Write a protein that binds this ligand. Structure first.
Ligand code: IIS
Ligand code: IIS
Length: 129
């Protein structure tokens, strides 16, 4: 990709301790699966390419970028220790959208639809065993 986009968030690091939990399995098999296939997922399936979108200020404003493509890699490549780390990544993705964009912009309506599904699924996050 372009030198004018930042490196994507970390998805590989052997020094970071890893664990499978039943909650992380739910986040991959239920939460990410549900959001990824949504009609409104596509803007969120990869990092924001600020060059291609002609948003040169995007990474001046958004200093903690996150997207579902990164989360999918982190879940599939066992990057997390716990569910809270992954829930935080989803919440960062939504708040980036809401901070950068005007309320009622199409992408905001798209993010809000995904966030409503997300909340319903996370309220049913299973008890950790
Ligand atoms: N190509 C695109 C377009 C949007 I809006 C968001 C992400 N990627
Ligand atoms: N100078 C710039 C930077 C970006 I990122 C996109 C367009 N023009």
């Amino acid at each position: 990709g372009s030198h004018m986009n930042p490196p994507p968030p970390e998805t590989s690091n052997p020094n970071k301790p890893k664990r499978q939990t039943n909650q992380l399995q739910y986040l991959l098999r239920v939460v990410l699966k549900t959001l990824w296939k949504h009609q409104f997922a596509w803007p969120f399936q990869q990092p924001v390419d600020a060059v291609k979108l002609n948003l040169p200020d995007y990474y001046k404003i958004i200093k903690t970028p996150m997207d579902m493509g990164t989360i999918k890699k982190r879940l599939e490549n066992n990057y997390y220790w716990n569910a809270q780390e992954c829930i935080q990544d989803f919440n960062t993705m939504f708040t980036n959208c809401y901070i950068y964009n005007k309320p009622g912009d199409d992408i905001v309506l798209m993010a809000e639809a995904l966030e409503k599904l997300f909340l319903q699924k996370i309220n049913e996050l299973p008890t950790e065993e």
